[PDB]
């Protein structure tokens, strides 16, 4: 017990952007200063110019991981191993929180690049983000809140089948606790979707495949 709370606290504490704040910005409600819309080459050039005048995303997941109960007690090389293979899956998982059917938030919510502008670029740049919009559209259909996402990301990182782990015994017992807590939290937070946990298991495998497809498309640069 008290594991879902401490994992949810580490998530709210270590992640600057969450689904609550993202949906508030995307709503265009409690602010008369909406994010800057990147929807063409000119607006993209405007945004790119101010950026020159992600390590933060990976650092946020690292601090969140070592704040998961038991993760700091692991061997240092296992903590590196668990983070090295699971960071991209967690990034793409939480990336759904800032995405809608028409675009995504960028730069801590200060910008919004439209989905159509991304798929209008020439090959192979228009193929980088569209697979993530496809995952996010079906992942957001599950209607997970930040309490669910915190436990979902924790199960992505703490898995004892990562290549090269040493203390595989403790990592599998730690995953057993996270998964058991995720299963019980899912039916308590989303009771009318009783197969939500099997659905999430398939999404974790989709993320592994989406990350593998991301590395291939990245190397063609």
């Amino acid at each position: 017990k008290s594991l879902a709370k401490r994992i949810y606290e580490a998530y709210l504490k270590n992640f600057n952007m969450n689904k609550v704040k993202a949906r508030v910005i995307l709503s265009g409600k409690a602010s008369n200063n909406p994010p800057f819309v990147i929807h063409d080459m000119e607006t993209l050039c405007m945004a790119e110019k101010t950026l020159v005048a992600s390590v933060e995303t990976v650092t946020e997941l690292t601090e969140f991981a070592k704040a998961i109960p038991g993760f700091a007690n692991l061997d240092l090389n296992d903590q590196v191993t668990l983070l090295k293979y699971g960071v991209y899956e967690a990034i793409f998982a939480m990336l759904s929180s800032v995405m809608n059917k028409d675009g995504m938030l960028v730069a801590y919510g200060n910008g919004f690049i439209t989905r159509e502008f991304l798929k209008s670029l020439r090959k192979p740049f228009c193929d980088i983000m569209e697979p993530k919009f496809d995952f996010a559209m079906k992942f957001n259909a599950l209607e997970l809140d930040d309490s669910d996402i915190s436990l979902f990301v924790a199960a992505i990182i703490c898995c004892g089948d990562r290549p090269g782990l040493l203390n595989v015994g403790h990592i599998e017992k730690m995953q057993e606790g996270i998964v058991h807590v995720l299963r019980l939290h899912l039916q308590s937070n989303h009771p009318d979707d009783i197969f939500l946990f099997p659905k999430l298991l398939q999404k974790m495998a989709d993320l592994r495949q989406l990350v593998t497809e991301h590395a291939q498309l990245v190397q063609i640069i």
Partner: peptide, 14 residues
């Protein structure tokens, strides 16, 4: 290659 980035963030509080 990001093992460098994550190992630095692991040793951030010190």
């Amino acid at each position: 290659g990001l093992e460098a980035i994550i190992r630095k963030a692991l040793m951030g509080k010190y």
